[PDB]
Design a protein around this ligand. Structure first.
Ligand code: BCL
Ligand code: BCL
Ligand code: BCL
Ligand code: BCL
Ligand SMILES: CC[C@H]1c2cc3[nH]c4c(c3C)C(=O)[C@H](C(=O)OC)c4c3nc(cc4[nH]c(cc(n2)[C@@H]1C)c(C(C)=O)c4C)[C@@H](C)[C@@H]3CCC(=O)OC/C=C(\C)CCC[C@H](C)CCC[C@H](C)CCCC(C)C
Ligand SMILES: CC[C@H]1c2cc3[nH]c4c(c3C)C(=O)[C@H](C(=O)OC)c4c3nc(cc4[nH]c(cc(n2)[C@@H]1C)c(C(C)=O)c4C)[C@@H](C)[C@@H]3CCC(=O)OC/C=C(\C)CCC[C@H](C)CCC[C@H](C)CCCC(C)C
Ligand SMILES: COC1=C(OC)C(=O)C(C/C=C(\C)CC/C=C(\C)CC/C=C(\C)CC/C=C(\C)CC/C=C(\C)CC/C=C(\C)CC/C=C(\C)CC/C=C(\C)CC/C=C(\C)CCC=C(C)C)=C(C)C1=O
Ligand SMILES: COC(C)(C)C/C=C/C(C)=C/C=C/C(C)=C/C=C/C(C)=C/C=C\C=C(C)\C=C\C=C(/C)CC/C=C(\C)CCC=C(C)C
Ligand SMILES: COC1=C(OC)C(=O)C(C/C=C(/C)CCC=C(C)C)=C(C)C1=O
Ligand SMILES: CCCCCCCCCCCC[N+](C)(C)[O-]
Ligand SMILES: CCCCCCCCCCCC[N+](C)(C)[O-]
Ligand SMILES: CCCCCCCCCCCC[N+](C)(C)[O-]
Ligand SMILES: CCCCCCCCCCCC[N+](C)(C)[O-]
Ligand SMILES: CCCCCCCCCCCC[N+](C)(C)[O-]
Ligand SMILES: CCCCCCCCCCCC[N+](C)(C)[O-]
Ligand SMILES: CCCCCCCCCCCC[N+](C)(C)[O-]
Ligand SMILES: [Fe+3]
Lengths: 281, 302, 240
């Protein structure tokens, strides 16, 4: 039940709520007040989904889907079989995610480490909240939120995107995408570079970080360094998500026409709007 | 407020770092570039040296030729007018030959010939660049992980511009060179194949793309959270585990009930990343060669 | 059909890859132990991988993992409950004893070396000719702890040569000796360096280094563990 080096770290302390009341583990898992909160929220949420499944009349995971209130309910309550369950499951999800982040903070404090991890996770939570809470509220109805189902949530992405034409033309979406692709690129290279150093050609000694800098300067004329790469992966992945949330929060609110038409502002600039030739003359 | 190690508070500099020698032909290395204090807030201040070499030159010349061929066509589409060039920059497009030319090299310059020439240059640029990622590791005695990883990106690329067109019987299936047009091509590809959301390899590619950001956010944040114990010195933590690697593993064991090592996180990393383009390339390559309509295929599972 | 074949194959491949990855990541810390240090009955469904060996540079030897695990140091903690899963109370001063968030690992009592075989980390005074290139130069500033008292003054910065970065501040105490403070644990301000982790009376307790111009992987761990431990353990002497 313990890693060989684990015991010296399992001291008391670090909790945010409850003093020593929940300061303990179950197998590998730390508990804490927020472990209890997470269990409660997640448990209710899952039970409510299983109840929503009965009211839908299916048990197949590819078919279970919990849809938010239809648009006519606005921002109000809805009968359970018709949107109410979604609404309660969403409060449960939120409670679970935030509890999970706060439990991570208790773990950081016990371990004497920086808070970077729950801080990073809070970006994902902010993205979920943009879709299920912030955007629907600004738009005036819960029904603009995505439904909880494996394929139905995809139907929502497709339908929502094509409401605005080819969603590729959302410029915040272009930036988000660029961060996603760049992040995967940098993840590949970081993993590969560390491993190429740690696992050199047969019979050779482990290479050093000096070799890692060298390899990347040889290759592209720069190396960000070992601190920098971890700063970078973190920045790229949080930026991707910041821009994801941004790209959606602005859609259906400040911009609601076809995203491709947004780009006319540049073509219509007085200096060149009226010169013939090219694509737009 | 405590210091968070996102940006450095104090930079230091010493003699330009010329790098490890090992088996590298030193005649082929530039001098050092300048030193960017701006960069140094976040990463290393030093630029260069870079390695040149014969393959290097070839790859760069080829890459330029690809870039210039597209840009020449763009200027032409702009009727040589600077103002129209900038106005319409994202709208220009160098397009592959029409279906009727099939796989032949016999289309006119203005109607696909130029596309093939640009593509030719892109092909030698990328592959000789691949050669360089292998060769620069070799000369340093390092593993070949970078070149193996790069090969997975190359695979989606080769599938899109080369292998899928060949299997379909025409260059018209390939992607055009343009900012907006490559996007239109992408949206169209999905429409014409019954919605890529029903392609299991597209959904896998997404799981991995999102998984990469999840994992890089996790790893990057973890290393920074343990940088106060020297956590980013990962190679020496692998050789001689410290309290950084242990606090890191235990953060995760305690949170989610399992954990990595300092070396093995890097393997979860490389694989999470390469599988984006591995599964992606497969999903595209199957699209239209074997499966005409993902929604249809999905209804039969087979 | 071929797509069906590819997808079924992929999932088999992926199960194999996850198995490979989880077992690679069992090269340290396993087998699992009970709280008393004996092998736990339940090791889980993944077995240990075959050993691999890393050849270390500069005559430092090799590392083979998995291998026998031991702490190689005394752990001054005791149970607080009669069953598994509860915290272990420090039996003395956890800062002095190096447990909890004050923990250190029995790393090699040698300095990390760069690719040329020289000490990776050196005081800047001995690093030719490294200098501050941007930001407030901390050298000469008073050092303040979380009790808002002055603990000493910065007399140098220890720098990583091959990576050109600041790693520690060397701080001189009232008695004329120095300590290392991790760069990540200090805040360089215009008139001072502020250290939230430690009150000023804890500075003398920071683990000392044996030679004044180098620091070993073991000494770094003890210094860094001790300073981080102050977050939890100096909290009574801190201080809104
Ligand atoms: C995966 C399915 C589609 C596709 C779908 C999309 C979608 C959707 C989006 C992009 C976006 C991008 N795509 Mg695309 N993309 C495809 C294949 C590619 C290929 C290729 C196969 O060689 C290339 C070069 C590009 C490149 C581009 C960039 C213009 C842009 C950001 C990429 C990035 O962050 O990379 C990683 C970062 C790097 C380190 C290198 C990238 C640097 C860029 C600037 C160079 C690429 C082209 C370059 C000539 C453009 C210069 C602009 C001016 C003409 C000077 N795409 C295929 C066909 N791509 C985003 C965009 O902003 O589009 C406008 C976007 O929203
Ligand atoms: C036809 C469809 C449209 C489309 C319309 C849309 C729409 C609509 C949306 C996007 C959004 C996204 N699109 Mg798009 N877009 C399309 C084309 C693409 C293409 C492409 C190559 O063509 C790409 C690369 C992208 C990429 C992007 C991303 C920038 C973004 C999704 C990531 C994200 O929001 O993360 C954010 C991460 C999360 C929300 C996850 C958070 C989860 C956390 C908090 C908790 C989960 C815990 C729990 C339940 C797990 C279970 C516990 C178990 C024990 C494991 N789109 C086409 C043009 N796109 C979305 C976006 O930005 O959303 C904000 C969005 O809503
Ligand atoms: C982010 C922008 C869009 C959206 C765009 C898309 C698109 C497009 C696709 C997915 C796909 C996925 N999405 Mg989605 N997705 C959205 C928000 C979510 C949220 C959420 C915010 O709570 C969740 C939990 C999911 C989860 C899912 C998975 C079923 C599937 C693979 C994801 C993945 O590997 O992520 C990366 C994270 C990891 C690798 C960690 C693993 C965690 C996963 C496996 C958790 C699964 C949870 C699920 C089975 C049930 C959760 C509830 C339980 C009762 C606890 N999506 C919003 C609406 N998503 C893909 C799919 O194939 O769907 C069929 C796909 O093509
Ligand atoms: C309307 C749009 C369609 C759709 C159509 C497509 C199509 C078509 C494709 C994808 C593909 C992808 N889609 Mg999709 N996509 C849909 C909706 C989404 C959504 C969403 C709704 O949220 C998401 C998250 C995604 C996400 C994804 C990615 C998982 C995947 C591309 C991975 C990649 O890294 O490629 C980026 C990486 C590369 C392109 C490889 C780069 C090649 C190397 C060699 C670079 C050479 C560059 C060099 C020469 C240039 C130098 C310039 C520098 C400045 C030096 N899609 C909808 C349903 N999608 C791709 C895929 O694999 O599908 C299975 C793909 O072909
Ligand atoms: C911000 C950058 C990226 C990121 C970062 C991030 N994610 C994080 C963290 C970080 C740093 C972790 O600390 C935390 C973690 O512990 O990881 C292992 C986590 C995490 N990210 C996770 C998932 C996840 N992250 C995602 C994405 C991202 N996370 C971003 C791309 C996605 C995507 C892309 O779709 C998913 C699916 C989990 C593995 C984990 C948090 C687990 C957790 O909160 O557990 C507590 C709650 C439960 C155990 C279950 C709650 C059940 C609900 C009450 C009911 C379900 C409702 C749900 C809304 C229905 C969904 C149905 C779907 C079909 C849509
Ligand atoms: C595993 C999946 C991910 C991935 C991985 C990946 N990419 C790779 C590799 C790997 C591991 C690298 O080894 C290789 C690399 O060298 O990275 C630094 C690379 C790479 N991926 C790149 C781009 C890229 N990768 C893509 C992304 C991805 N790559 C996936 C998400 C994308 C997307 C998302 O579309 C882009 C656009 C390059 C940065 C690099 C491959 C470089 C290359 O093939 O070069 C060929 C052409 C040239 C040599 C130059 C081209 C000409 C330029 C247009 C001119 C402008 C600059 C010029 C060089 C200036 C010259 C001036 C002088 C005269 C002074
Ligand atoms: C260098 O360092 C590093 C390490 O270490 C040395 C690492 O470990 C890691 C961690 C990374 C890995 C282990 C790699 C693989 C990780 C991923 C691919 C991320 C995706 C994760 C999953 C698919 C698993 C998610 C499972 C979870 C979140 C656990 C589910 C737990 C429950 C049963 C939930 C119920 C409630 C609980 C447990 C709360 C507690 C309360 C009670 C039990 C009461 C990183 C990043 C790192 O960089
Ligand atoms: C200022 O003006 C100048 C002219 C000086 C410079 C400006 C230039 C400009 C504006 C350039 C702009 C370039 C742009 C916008 C390019 C964008 C390209 C994009 C977005 C590419 C996206 C997809 C590319 C793919 C998938 C291509 C794949 C290519 C291959 C796999 C190569 C296949 C090889 C073929 C078909 C040739 C076969 C030949 C043999 C025999 C091997
Ligand atoms: C293997 O790890 C990596 C580094 O290598 C040691 C890097 O160097 C970079 C390059 C990062 C940046 C900031 C490019 C911009 C720099 C200039 C010249 C302005 C990436 C992506 C990376 O993955
Ligand atoms: C030409 C695209 C180059 C790829 C880099 C990122 C793409 C985003 C381009 C859109 C710029 C957004 N904005 C608002 C500044 O116009
Ligand atoms: C190398 C890291 C920089 C990201 C490069 C990827 C292209 C995305 C465009 C960057 C635009 C960001 N911003 C905030 C300036 O608009
Ligand atoms: C891609 C790297 C470029 C990013 C440069 C950002 C510079 C930020 C400088 C902040 C300095 C903070 N402070 C207070 C210590 O000076
Ligand atoms: C993707 C990063 C590209 C960075 C390119 C850096 C080029 C370094 C220039 C070195 C030239 C030095 N010099 C003039 C002495 O030869
Ligand atoms: C590095 C390995 C991590 C494995 C993560 C795999 C997540 C699986 C998500 C299911 C995707 C479903 N589908 C049908 C689109 O393939
Ligand atoms: C893809 C999501 C699947 C959910 C399973 C999560 C994996 C956690 C494995 C740790 C199990 C903990 N333990 C030691 C009690 O077995
Ligand atoms: C995305 C990959 C999903 C797989 C992650 C689940 C693997 C759990 C491994 C748990 C094993 C922990 N244990 C018992 C060896 O200590
Ligand atoms: Fe790393």
């Amino acid at each position: 039940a313990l890693l060989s080096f684990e015991r010296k770290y399992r001291v008391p302390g670090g909790t945010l709520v409850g003093g020593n009341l929940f300061d303990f583990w179950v197998g590998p898992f730390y508990v804490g007040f927020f472990g209890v909160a997470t269990f409660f929220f997640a448990a209710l949420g899952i039970i409510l989904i299983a109840w929503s499944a009965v009211l839908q009349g299916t048990w197949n995971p590819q078919l279970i889907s919990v849809y938010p209130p239809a648009l006519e309910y606005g921002l109000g309550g809805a009968p359970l079989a018709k949107g109410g369950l979604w609404q309660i499951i969403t409060i449960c999800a939120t409670g679970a995610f935030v509890s999970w982040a706060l439990r991570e903070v208790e773990i950081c404090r016990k371990l004497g480490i920086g808070y970077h991890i729950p801080f990073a996770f809070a970006f994902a939570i902010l993205a979920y909240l943009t879709l299920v809470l912030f955007r629907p509220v600004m738009m005036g109805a819960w029904g603009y939120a995505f439904p909880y189902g494996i394929w139905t949530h995809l139907d929502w992405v497709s339908n929502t995107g094509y409401t605005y034409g080819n969603f590729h033309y959302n410029p915040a979406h272009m930036i988000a995408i660029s961060f996603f692709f760049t992040n995967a690129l940098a993840l590949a290279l970081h993993g590969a570079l560390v491993l190429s150093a740690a696992n050199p050609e047969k019979g050779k000694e482990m290479r050093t970080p000096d070799h890692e800098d060298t390899f990347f300067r040889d290759l592209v004329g720069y190396s960000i360094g070992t601190l920098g790469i971890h700063r970078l992966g973190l920045l790229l992945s949080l930026s991707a998500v910041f821009f994801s949330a941004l790209c959606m929060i602005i859609t259906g609110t400040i911009w609601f026409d076809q995203w491709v038409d947004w780009w006319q502002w540049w073509v219509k600039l007085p200096w060149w709007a009226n010169i013939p030739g090219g694509i737009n003359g | 407020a405590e210091y968070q190690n996102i940006f450095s508070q104090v930079q230091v500099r010493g003699p330009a770092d010329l790098g490890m020698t090992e088996d590298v032909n030193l005649a082929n290395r530039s001098g050092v570039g300048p030193f960017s204090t701006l960069l140094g807030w976040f990463g290393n201040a030093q630029l260069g040296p870079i390695y040149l070499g014969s393959l290097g030159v070839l790859s760069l010349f080829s890459g330029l030729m690809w870039f210039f061929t597209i840009g020449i066509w763009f200027w032409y589409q702009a009727g040589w007018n600077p103002a129209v060039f900038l106005r319409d920059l994202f709208f220009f497009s160098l397009e592959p030959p029409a279906p009727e030319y099939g796989l032949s090299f016999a289309a006119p310059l203005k109607e696909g010939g130029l596309w093939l020439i640009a593509s030719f240059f892109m092909f030698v640029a990328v592959w000789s660049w691949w050669g360089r990622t292998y060769l620069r590791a070799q000369a340093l005695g390092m593993g070949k992980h970078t070149a193996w990883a790069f090969l997975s990106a190359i695979w989606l690329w080769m599938v899109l511009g080369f292998i899928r067109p060949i299997l379909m019987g025409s260059w018209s299936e390939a992607v055009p060179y343009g900012i907006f047009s490559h996007l239109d091509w992408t949206n169209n590809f999905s429409l014409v194949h019954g919605n890529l959301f029903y392609n299991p390899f597209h959904g896998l590619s997404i799981a991995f793309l999102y998984g990469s950001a999840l994992l890089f956010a996790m790893h990057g944040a973890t290393i920074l959270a343990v940088s106060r114990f020297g956590g980013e010195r990962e190679l020496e933590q692998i050789a001689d585990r410290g309290t950084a690697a242990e606090r890191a593993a235990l953060f995760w064991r305690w949170t989610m009930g399992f954990n990595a090592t300092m070396e093995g996180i890097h393997r979860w990393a490389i694989w999470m990343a390469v599988l984006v383009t591995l599964t992606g390339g497969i999903g595209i390559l199957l699209s239209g060669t074997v499966v005409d309509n993902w929604y249809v295929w999905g209804q039969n599972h087979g | 059909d071929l797509a069906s074949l590819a997808i079924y194959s992929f999932w088999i491949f992926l199960a194999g890859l996850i198995y490979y990855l989880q077992t690679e990541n069992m090269r340290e810390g396993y087998p699992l132990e009970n709280e008393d240090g004996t092998p736990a009955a339940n090791q889980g469904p993944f077995p240990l991988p075959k050993p691999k060996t890393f050849i270390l540079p500069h005559g430092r030897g090799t590392l083979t993992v998995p291998g026998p695990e031991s702490e190689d140091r005394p752990i001054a903690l005791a149970r607080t409950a009669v069953s598994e899963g509860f915290p272990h109370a420090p039996t003395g001063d956890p800062m002095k004893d190096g447990v909890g968030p004050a923990s250190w690992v029995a790393r090699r009592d040698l300095p990390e070396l760069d690719g040329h075989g020289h000490n990776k980390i050196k005081p800047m005074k001995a690093a030719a000719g490294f200098h501050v290139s941007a930001g407030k130069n901390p050298i000469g500033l008073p050092v303040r702890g979380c009790d808002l008292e002055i603990a000493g003054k910065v007399v140098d910065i220890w720098v990583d040569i091959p990576e050109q970065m600041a790693r520690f501040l060397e701080v001189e105490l009232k008695d004329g000796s120095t300590r290392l403070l991790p760069m990540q644990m200090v805040k360089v301000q215009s008139n001072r360096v502020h250290v939230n982790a430690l009150s000023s009376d804890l500075f003398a307790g920071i683990p000392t280094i044996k030679s004044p111009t180098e620091v070993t992987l073991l000494e770094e761990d003890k210094i860094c563990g001790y300073v981080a431990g102050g977050l939890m353990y100096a909290a009574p002497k801190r201080k809104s």
